[PDB]
């Protein structure tokens, strides 16, 4: 089997991407944030505290003839941005882009933190990291990908995120029309439950490539590119008037600037992030200070290849017995 779904930016900055997902019988379609940095499929629901719902579409398990309570199961997750959610668990039929899993754990939110309530466009998350990170207790549950994998034509999914435009998540096949050149594959460590890999270095603009190992995660659920402070300083030193602002919480730059590109290494290959991808617009409405899309990972404990990096590539998440990542230009 295969599936193919369009993923759409939630706003003019590409702060996140939403993908329609069918849950239950008859289908209830929710727009989920596909997150390769976590492993829970959770939704706003008929159980969510009413004051914490503000415009989201909800899953109502009582209206699904295939929903079953997973008795005794609870979940509770905290994300790297400080957000959180928790609740109870149903199993139900979940379809993405024509690919159907029966008996998928659908984690129903009873509580969500304020940043979820405030994002009216995100109805929940669909985690695509390794199932070892799933938070369901006392019986850990599998991701949608792990449940689909044996049925898929090939045990892979691909992320093709757009810059200020829709893109695609495919399951079970490589679309050889969706990228240029060849796909470079690189090793993955699953020891922390992430799609963790080692970039071979970077360049700033038209500068020379610096060969250096950068361990980090491929994370579609993180907006920005978080790298070591040395690398990030080297980037923003090429932008007149850029500075790290403790009050704003990262590097800012004059909105009048034209930004240089950023290149990262994948083995001997190179992915170029155009400068405009690194502009996240005014820090507050009408400001002439703009927020940078490359930020320091120093306060995080891991480097994060988030959407700023991934949207410059066609990315293969290869779930073969020994997982690997693939990157192609596009
Ligand atoms: C949608 C927001 C950004 C709201 N707090 O929640 C996350 C957090 C994550 F770390 C990952 C993700 F995909 C969504």
Q: What's the half-sphere exposure (Cβ side, CA atoms, 13 Å) at 232?
A: 22
- Parent domain of 53: 5-174
For residues 68 and 198, state if they share a domain: no
For residues 105 and 236, state if they share a domain: no
Question: Ligand 1 pocket, 80 CB below 6 A?
Answer: yes
Catalytic residue among 199, 261, 296, 297: 199
Question: Ligand 1 pocket, 92 CB below 6 A?
Answer: no
Q: What distance in Å separates the CA atoms of residue 143 and residue 90, rounded to the nearest whole number?
A: 14
Contact 86, 11 (CB under 8 A): no
Ligand 1 mean position, distance from CA 129 (Å): 14
Instruction: State how many domains the chain has.
Output: 2
For residues 144 and 204, state if they share a domain: no
Q: What distance in Å separates the CA atoms of residue 88 and residue 109, rounded to the nearest whole number?
A: 7
154, 174, 194: which is the final residue of a domain?
A: 174
Determine the residue of 16, 19, 127 to mutate for testing ligand 1's pocket, defined as the one with the most ligand atoms within 8 A of the Cβ atom. 16
What sign results for the dihedral spanned by CA atoms 58, 280, 201, 178? positive
For residues 86 and 186, state if they share a domain: no
Q: Beta 184-187 vs 17-23: how paired, if at all? A: unpaired
Residue owning the nearest CA to atom 2 of ligand 1: 116
Say which CATH number the domain at 116 has: 2.40.70.10
For residues 179 and 294, state if they share a domain: yes
For 147, list phi and psi in degrees, rounded to 5. Answer: -65, -35
174, 198, 217: which is the final residue of a domain?
A: 174
159, 174, 189: which is the final residue of a domain?
A: 174
Ligand 1 mean position, distance from CA 222 (Å): 7
For residues 316 and 264, state if they share a domain: yes
For residues 129 and 97, state if they share a domain: yes
Residue owning the nearest CA to atom 12 of ligand 1: 221
Is 284 part of the annotated catalytic residue set?
no
Ligand 1 mean position, distance from CA 158 (Å): 20
Task: Give the 3-state secondary structure of residue 190.
Answer: coil
For residues 186 and 125, state if they share a domain: no
For residues 88 and 164, state if they share a domain: yes
Q: Name which of 119, 126, 106, 136 is nearest 37 in CA terms.
A: 126
For residues 85 and 211, state if they share a domain: no
- Enter the tokens of residue 128: 């695509």
- Enter the tokens of residue 42: 């959770």
For residues 293 and 309, state if they share a domain: yes
The vertex-247 CA angle with 244 and 249, nearest 5°, equals 60
Contact 194, 37 (CB under 8 A): yes
For residues 33 and 116, state if they share a domain: yes
């Amino acid at each position: 089997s295969t599936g193919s779904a369009t993923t759409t930016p939630i706003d003019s900055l590409d702060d996140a991407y939403i993908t329609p997902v069918q849950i239950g019988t008859p289908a209830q379609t929710l727009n989920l944030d596909f997150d390769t940095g976590s492993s829970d499929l959770w939704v706003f629901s008929s159980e969510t505290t009413a004051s914490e719902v503000d415009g989201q579409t909800i899953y109502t398990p009582s209206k699904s003839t295939t929903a079953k309570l997973l008795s005794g199961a609870t979940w509770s997750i905290s994300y790297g941005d400080g957000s959180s959610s928790s609740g109870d668990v149903y199993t139900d039929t979940v379809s993405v882009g024509g690919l159907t899993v029966t008996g998928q754990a659908v984690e129903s939110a009873k509580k969500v933190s304020s940043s979820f309530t405030e994002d009216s466009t995100i109805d929940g998350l669909l985690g695509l990291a390794f199932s070892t990170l799933n938070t369901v207790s006392p019986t850990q549950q599998k991701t949608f990908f792990d449940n689909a994998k044996a049925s898929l034509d090939s045990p892979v999914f691909t992320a093709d995120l757009g810059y200020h435009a829709p893109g695609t998540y495919n399951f079970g096949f490589i679309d050889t029309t969706a990228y240029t050149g060849s796909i470079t594959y690189t090793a993955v460590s699953t020891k922390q439950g992430f799609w963790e890999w080692t970039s071979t270095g970077y360049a700033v603009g038209s500068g020379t490539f610096k060969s250096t190992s950068i361990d980090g995660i491929a994370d579609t659920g993180t907006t920005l590119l978080y790298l070591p402070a040395t690398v990030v300083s080297a980037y923003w030193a090429q932008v007149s008037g850029a500075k790290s602002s403790s009050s704003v919480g990262g590097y800012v730059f004059p909105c009048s600037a034209t930004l240089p590109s950023f290149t990262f290494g994948v083995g001997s290959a190179r992915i170029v992030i155009p400068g405009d991808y690194i502009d996240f617009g005014p820090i507050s409405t009408g400001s002439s200070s703009c927020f940078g899309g490359i930020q320091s990972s120093a306060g995080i404990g891991i480097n994060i290849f988030g959407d700023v990096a991934l949207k410059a590539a066609f990315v293969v998440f290869n779930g073969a017995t020994t997982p690997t990542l693939g990157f192609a230009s596009k």
